[PDB]
Design a protein around this motif. Structure first.
Motif, PDB file in Angstrom:
ATOM      1  N   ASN A 166       0.882  -1.170   0.000  1.00  0.00           N
ATOM      2  CA  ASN A 166       0.000   0.000   0.000  1.00  0.00           C
ATOM      3  C   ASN A 166       0.926   1.228   0.000  1.00  0.00           C
ATOM      4  N   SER A 167       0.874   2.047  -1.048  1.00  0.00           N
ATOM      5  CA  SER A 167       1.756   3.220  -1.120  1.00  0.00           C
ATOM      6  C   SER A 167       1.563   4.264  -0.004  1.00  0.00           C
ATOM      7  N   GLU A 168       0.445   4.202   0.706  1.00  0.00           N
ATOM      8  CA  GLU A 168       0.223   5.167   1.777  1.00  0.00           C
ATOM      9  C   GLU A 168       0.986   4.765   3.031  1.00  0.00           C
ATOM     10  N   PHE A 169       1.623   3.596   2.977  1.00  0.00           N
ATOM     11  CA  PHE A 169       2.410   3.100   4.105  1.00  0.00           C
ATOM     12  C   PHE A 169       3.891   3.045   3.759  1.00  0.00           C
ATOM     13  N   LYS A 170       4.725   3.025   4.790  1.00  0.00           N
ATOM     14  CA  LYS A 170       6.169   2.976   4.616  1.00  0.00           C
ATOM     15  C   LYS A 170       6.739   1.674   5.180  1.00  0.00           C
ATOM     16  N   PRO A 171       7.891   1.239   4.663  1.00  0.00           N
ATOM     17  CA  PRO A 171       8.517   0.004   5.144  1.00  0.00           C
ATOM     18  C   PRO A 171       8.941   0.176   6.591  1.00  0.00           C
ATOM     19  N   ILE A 172       8.895  -0.906   7.359  1.00  0.00           N
ATOM     20  CA  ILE A 172       9.318  -0.847   8.749  1.00  0.00           C
ATOM     21  C   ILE A 172      10.676  -1.525   8.814  1.00  0.00           C
ATOM     22  N   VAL A 173      11.702  -0.771   9.208  1.00  0.00           N
ATOM     23  CA  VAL A 173      13.046  -1.325   9.312  1.00  0.00           C
ATOM     24  C   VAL A 173      13.325  -1.653  10.775  1.00  0.00           C
ATOM     25  N   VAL A 174      13.811  -2.866  11.014  1.00  0.00           N
ATOM     26  CA  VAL A 174      14.102  -3.325  12.367  1.00  0.00           C
ATOM     27  C   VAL A 174      15.568  -3.700  12.537  1.00  0.00           C
ATOM     28  N   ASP A 175      16.156  -3.278  13.649  1.00  0.00           N
ATOM     29  CA  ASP A 175      17.544  -3.618  13.939  1.00  0.00           C
ATOM     30  C   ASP A 175      17.466  -4.708  14.993  1.00  0.00           C
ATOM     31  N   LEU A 176      17.807  -5.923  14.585  1.00  0.00           N
ATOM     32  CA  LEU A 176      17.743  -7.076  15.469  1.00  0.00           C
ATOM     33  C   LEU A 176      18.526  -6.886  16.762  1.00  0.00           C
ATOM     34  N   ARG A 177      19.598  -6.105  16.692  1.00  0.00           N
ATOM     35  CA  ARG A 177      20.419  -5.837  17.867  1.00  0.00           C
ATOM     36  C   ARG A 177      19.697  -4.885  18.828  1.00  0.00           C
ATOM     37  N   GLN A 178      19.053  -3.863  18.267  1.00  0.00           N
ATOM     38  CA  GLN A 178      18.357  -2.829  19.041  1.00  0.00           C
ATOM     39  C   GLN A 178      16.939  -3.093  19.560  1.00  0.00           C
ATOM     40  N   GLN A 179      16.130  -3.818  18.799  1.00  0.00           N
ATOM     41  CA  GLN A 179      14.757  -4.080  19.224  1.00  0.00           C
ATOM     42  C   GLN A 179      14.382  -5.559  19.213  1.00  0.00           C
ATOM     43  N   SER A 180      13.330  -5.899  19.951  1.00  0.00           N
ATOM     44  CA  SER A 180      12.863  -7.280  20.027  1.00  0.00           C
ATOM     45  C   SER A 180      12.002  -7.607  18.808  1.00  0.00           C
ATOM     46  N   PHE A 181      12.383  -8.656  18.090  1.00  0.00           N
ATOM     47  CA  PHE A 181      11.673  -9.070  16.883  1.00  0.00           C
ATOM     48  C   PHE A 181      11.386 -10.564  16.883  1.00  0.00           C
ATOM     49  N   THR A 182      10.123 -10.918  16.663  1.00  0.00           N
ATOM     50  CA  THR A 182       9.711 -12.316  16.626  1.00  0.00           C
ATOM     51  C   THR A 182       8.723 -12.594  15.499  1.00  0.00           C
ATOM     52  N   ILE A 183       8.939 -13.708  14.812  1.00  0.00           N
ATOM     53  CA  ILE A 183       8.048 -14.137  13.748  1.00  0.00           C
ATOM     54  C   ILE A 183       6.985 -14.962  14.468  1.00  0.00           C
ATOM     55  N   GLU A 184       5.746 -14.501  14.410  1.00  0.00           N
ATOM     56  CA  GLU A 184       4.645 -15.211  15.055  1.00  0.00           C
ATOM     57  C   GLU A 184       4.139 -16.342  14.172  1.00  0.00           C
TER      58      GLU A 184
END
Lengths: 130, 130
Positions: A97-115
């Protein structure tokens, strides 16, 4: 049938009892890999591929996901549905959706989990109609 | 479960045996009015509301349809899925995709039948994966 997960309380596990809104029998031969739960989608970030606000996303429970797949991800308590694009210690969650922007995540800096992995969509399950 | 209708042979009734590709158990409490059959969608004419090519449309068998609803219609043997907009002896079948144009039907001049009402969508049922 498959449990339907509504909005998820920050930091709280997806299948927490408070999140379940009901259960719906869905023929397992319908999706591959098999759907383990349904998740109501919030927003139009994936509208270009037909995943609309309020849709029920069929999700396969796994963390075995690859670039290009649409996944359910949790970034700092927030649960989102986006297309995965990982690169080293950097993960990009891309919208459709062009009205949205990509979300960039730094695995070192924030908690990220594939549900889980998106394997289908069921549109309906309206909370307004009896 | 609900029968899945694939491409329909010109002039041939929707639930003709040759059209059925399988049956899928779908919890009846999912859609309202209740879904009576599934219909594979051809094309992107309804993409803007999330109905994509290859989607399985949940259809309630009825002819009791009103303007604004998405219906399954048959115009001169051709079966289509569009938003209904009738006006006297003229029926407009509107798309939800700017690359498509409205279909205007003259009830006096051509054969027009409402096959059913769209009550939902199930995305998957892939004919390529085992």
């Amino acid at each position: 049938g498959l449990p339907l997960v509504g909005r998820v309380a920050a930091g709280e596990p997806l299948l927490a009892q408070q999140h379940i809104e009901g259960h719906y029998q869905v023929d397992p031969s319908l999706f591959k890999p098999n759907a383990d739960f349904l998740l109501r989608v919030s927003g139009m970030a994936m509208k270009d591929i037909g995943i609309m606000d309020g849709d029920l996303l069929a999700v396969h429970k796994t963390q075995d996901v690859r670039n290009g797949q649409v996944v359910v991800a949790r970034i700092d308590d927030e649960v989102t549905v986006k297309r995965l694009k990982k690169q080293g210690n950097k993960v990009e969650l891309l919208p459709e959706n062009s009205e949205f922007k990509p979300i960039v995540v730094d695995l070192r800096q924030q908690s990220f989990t594939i549900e889980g992995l998106a394997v289908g969509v069921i549109r309906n399950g309206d909370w307004l109609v009896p």
